[PDB]
């Protein structure tokens, strides 16, 4: 039941400020000093900054030193980042740790918060566009061009799930993301029967059904 | 300026199986060092903290001896459960530094990936732009080893991967490879190829297809 309860993130262009929040459950924040932690797509852990119990210091990783500010009220049984001057490499799902030692530092972290992503970049919130990939053959859909994460696919209104992947989206250089999204299917069956694909991206409130089909 | 380094990056064993990874610190740190278990879009876990003592839930199989630079994590018989990643962390100095972790992925046998390149559609085409798509599905293990090849020229900065997490059911990856031109350019060309060579492939497979 123990558990650090995390808010605030979302997506902000170069320059501009955001703040985080984690609120403490079940127990009192207001003895155990404050670690975050940050995780770049796909990269590993990053420290970032940490607040002794009363908040007298404030110890902060190299990479965000002068830029983000950790703080504590200790009434709202809540600790805060705030992270100003804000640069695309910090784009990463932040981590607000308990300390394992409060009323003292030990340096270790024994419960984690659910994790909140940050974006940071100039794109603007856009839709995909929704490509088909034609075709025991392979068939898919491409997603391109869509800002920002995350977006979801389903095949035939969520009834095709055997043999589907969904790979992971990349960041183009251009600043949006693309994706596809495959089914492995029996070859007698291409004219048969129907196979749709259902793009959601609910940041451009963009829902999008295409019907692959053969040459 | 204290640098971790852990070691292998990427470890593959199967369940059951006696599992050690490294990690050493490019100065002095005594003792104190966690590890970490992480899970695909989950938070970290603590583990192990000064080295070798266990936190409280853990299983006995999970050992860690270390001291001065040179660490080490041991699951002794490796359970289903046991597969993430590990993060170790020195706690000496600050500013506090993780390692970059290692994953330990599940082992089968070798798989063949099966091969499939799709054209651009006319639709993409329209917009003035042109994905070229090159499938490589469920095979083992994750190296390979895709080369696209445009009227027989081998091409290079154009097209980007991406692959997925280990199968639950089979263990098996499975990648896409695109290559991204401008419609002009794409039309400057007949022949378009990606060639895969694989661990469990003879020699390399090559998928062709001729624009028009």
């Known amino acids: 039941q123990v558990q650090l309860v995390q808010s605030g993130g979302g997506v902000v262009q170069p320059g501009r400020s955001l703040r985080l929040s984690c609120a403490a459950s079940?127990?009192?924040?207001?003895?155990?000093?404050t670690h975050w932690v940050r995780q770049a797509p796909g990269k590993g852990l990053e420290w970032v900054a940490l607040i002794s119990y009363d908040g007298s210091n404030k110890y902060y990783a190299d990479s965000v030193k002068g830029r983000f500010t950790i703080s504590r009220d200790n009434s709202m049984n809540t600790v805060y980042l705030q992270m100003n001057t804000l640069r695309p490499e910090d784009t990463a799902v932040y981590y607000c740790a308990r300390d394992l030692g409060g009323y003292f530092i030990r340096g270790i972290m024994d419960v984690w918060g659910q994790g909140t992503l940050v974006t940071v970049s100039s794109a603007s919130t856009k839709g995909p566009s929704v490509f088909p990939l034609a075709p025991t053959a392979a068939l898919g859909c491409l997603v391109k061009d869509y800002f920002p994460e995350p977006v979801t696919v389903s095949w035939n209104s969520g009834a095709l799930t055997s043999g589907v992947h969904t790979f992971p989206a990349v960041l183009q250089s251009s600043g949006l993301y693309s994706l596809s999204s495959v089914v492995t299917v029996p070859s007698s069956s291409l004219g048969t029967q129907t196979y749709i694909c259902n793009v959601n991206h609910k940041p451009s409130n963009t829902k999008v059904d295409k019907r692959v089909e053969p040459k | 300026e204290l640098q971790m380094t852990q070691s292998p990056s990427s470890v593959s064993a199967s369940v059951g199986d006696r599992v050690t990874i490294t990690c050493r610190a490019s100065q002095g740190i005594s003792s104190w060092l966690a590890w970490y278990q992480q899970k695909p879009g989950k938070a970290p876990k603590l583990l192990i903290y000064?080295?070798?003592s266990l936190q409280s839930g853990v299983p006995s199989r999970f050992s860690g001896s270390g001291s001065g630079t040179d660490f080490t994590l041991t699951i002794s018989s490796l359970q289903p459960e046991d597969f993430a990643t590990y993060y170790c962390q020195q706690a000496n100095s600050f500013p506090l530094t993780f390692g970059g972790g290692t994953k330990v992925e599940i082992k089968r046998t070798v798989a063949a990936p099966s091969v499939f390149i799709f054209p651009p559609s006319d639709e993409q085409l329209k917009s003035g732009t042109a994905s070229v798509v090159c499938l490589l599905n469920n095979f083992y293990p994750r190296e390979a080893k895709v080369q696209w090849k445009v009227d027989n020229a081998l091409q290079s900065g154009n097209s980007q991967e991406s692959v997925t997490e280990q199968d639950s059911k089979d263990s098996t990856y499975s990648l896409s490879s695109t290559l991204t031109l401008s419609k002009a350019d794409y039309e400057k060309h007949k022949v378009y190829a990606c060639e895969v060579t694989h661990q469990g492939l003879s020699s390399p497979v090559t998928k062709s297809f001729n624009r028009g």
């Open positions: 000064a080295a070798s």
């Open positions: 079940e127990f009192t924040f207001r003895m155990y000093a």
